[PDB]
Amino acid sequence: LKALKDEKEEARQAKITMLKERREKKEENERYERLAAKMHAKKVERMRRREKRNKALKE
Amino acid sequence: SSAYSSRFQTPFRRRREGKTDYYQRKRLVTQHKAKYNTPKYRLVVRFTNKDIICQIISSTITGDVVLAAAYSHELPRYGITHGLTNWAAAYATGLLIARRTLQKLGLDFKVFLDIGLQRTTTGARVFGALKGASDGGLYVPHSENRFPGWDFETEEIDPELLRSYIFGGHVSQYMEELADDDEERFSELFKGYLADDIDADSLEDIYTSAHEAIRADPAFKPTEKKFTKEQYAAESKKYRQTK
C-alpha cells in the first residue's frame, strides 16, 4: 500500500510543480513589466509636477 | 500587450486595407426600400498604374455582382496602343462600357457614379470617364463644375477646352513644347511615340478612330486565353508553399 500511494501522489505532485513553475514564470515577467511601467510613470509625474497646470480649465 | 490586444476591436478586412469606405458605401447601396427589389446600379471607376478599370456593379448579400466590366487594355484592338491611363483613354473606356451596357439592355440605364477614394478635383479622369459614359447615353446625375477649364473665379465653363482635353490637347502641346525645346526628356518620355511619329491632328483622328470603333463593336471581344487553367494552376503550385 505504501508503495502504491507514494508513486501515485508523486506523479500528481510532479504535475502540480509543473503547473506552479509555469504560472510563476508568467506572473514573474508580468510583474517585472508592470513594475518598470510604474517607475516610469512615477518619474514622468515627478517632472510634470514642476509644470503649474491647473488641470481644469483649458491651458 | 495581452490586455490591449484583447480589448482591441478590429475593423472590417476591406477597411484594414485602404480599399473601401463604408460611410459612402451605405449611402450608395441603401435603397428607398418602399420600392422593394429595384436594384441600384453604380459605375465603379478605378485607376492603377498602367491600367484603368471601369465596371458596373449591383450589390447584394451574396456580396456583389458584375454584369458589365471593361478595361483599358482593350483599346489596342480599337486603335490605340499608347497612353492607356490618360484622360482621353479613360473617357474612351467609359464610352465603351456605356455603349456595352446599353446594348445588353437593348435600349440604344440610370447608374450612380462611385468616386472611390480619389479626390474630387477640377479636371479629373473619373469625371472624364463620367463624360464618356454620359456620351454613351446612360443618365448619371452630375454638374458642369468639375470638368476642366472651369474658371474658378466664376460660375462658367468653356466647352472647347475640355474638347481639347478629350482629343488629347494638353499632352500634344506638351509634346510640341518639349520637342522644340529639348530632346533628352522627349526621347525618354516618348520612345514609342517617337518611333511612331504621330501628329496632333493625327492623335485626335486616332481617338475619333477608336470612338467610332467602340460604337461599332462594344460587344466585348474577349481574350484568347492561351495555356488553359491546369497549366497556370500547376505552374503556380510549383512556387506556392504548403504546410
Binding site: 491651458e59 | 486595407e17 485602404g18 480599399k19 472611390g116 477614394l117 480619389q118
Partner: protein, 168 residues
C-alpha cells in the same frame, strides 16, 4: 547589397524660435525667406507660460521646410559652420539628425545690422524609396523592419558622404 535600399536625404526643416513676437519675427521671416527662396510659415504658441514671457496665439516662431538638391546644398553650407563635426548624439533612433547654429551670418549672408542676428535649428529627416505607403490615402500601410532607417546606418552614411567624425 543595396540596389534600391539606399539612404537619400528627404528634407530639411529650418526653424527659428524667438523670445518675442513682432518685427523680430518678421525679420526672422525675411531671413528664412531669403535663404530658401520660398515663403516660410509662422508658428504660434500652444499655451500660455508666463515665465518665458508669452501667451496663447502669439506668433512666437517661424520655420520652413526644403526638399531636393537645395536641401543638401543648404545642409552642407550650414555644416561648414559646424565644420563637419557632430556628436554621437544629434542622431535620433529612427534615423534622423539635426543641429543648431548661432550667428546665421556664418553662411554667406552678411551682417546687415538693419535687422540684427538670429540663430536657427536644422533638422533633417532620412528615408529610402517606398515611404509613400505610410503617406498616401488609398492602400495605406507601413514599412518593414529590414527597410527601417536607423542611427547606425545614418552614422555610417555620414562618416561616408561629408566625410565627417563622431566626436564621442
Amino acid at each position: 547589397q543595396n540596389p534600391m535600399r539606399d539612404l537619400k536625404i528627404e528634407k530639411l526643416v529650418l526653424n527659428i524660435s524667438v523670445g518675442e513676437s513682432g518685427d523680430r519675427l518678421t525679420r526672422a521671416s525675411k531671413v528664412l525667406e531669403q535663404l530658401s527662396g520660398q515663403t516660410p510659415v509662422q508658428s504660434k504658441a500652444r499655451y500660455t507660460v508666463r515665465t518665458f514671457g508669452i501667451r496663447r496665439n502669439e506668433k512666437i516662431a517661424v520655420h520652413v521646410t526644403v526638399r531636393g538638391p537645395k536641401a543638401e546644398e543648404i545642409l552642407e553650407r550650414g555644416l561648414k559652420v559646424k565644420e563637419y563635426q557632430l556628436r554621437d548624439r544629434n542622431f535620433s533612433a529612427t534615423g534622423n539628425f539635426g543641429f543648431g547654429i548661432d550667428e546665421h551670418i556664418d553662411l554667406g549672408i552678411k551682417y546687415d545690422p538693419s535687422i540684427g542676428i538670429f540663430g536657427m535649428d536644422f533638422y533633417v529627416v532620412m528615408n529610402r524609396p517606398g515611404a509613400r505607403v505610410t503617406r498616401r490615402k488609398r492602400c495605406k500601410g507601413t514599412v518593414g523592419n529590414s527597410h527601417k532607417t536607423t542611427k547606425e546606418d545614418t552614422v555610417s552614411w555620414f562618416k561616408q558622404k561629408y566625410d565627417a567624425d563622431v566626436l564621442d
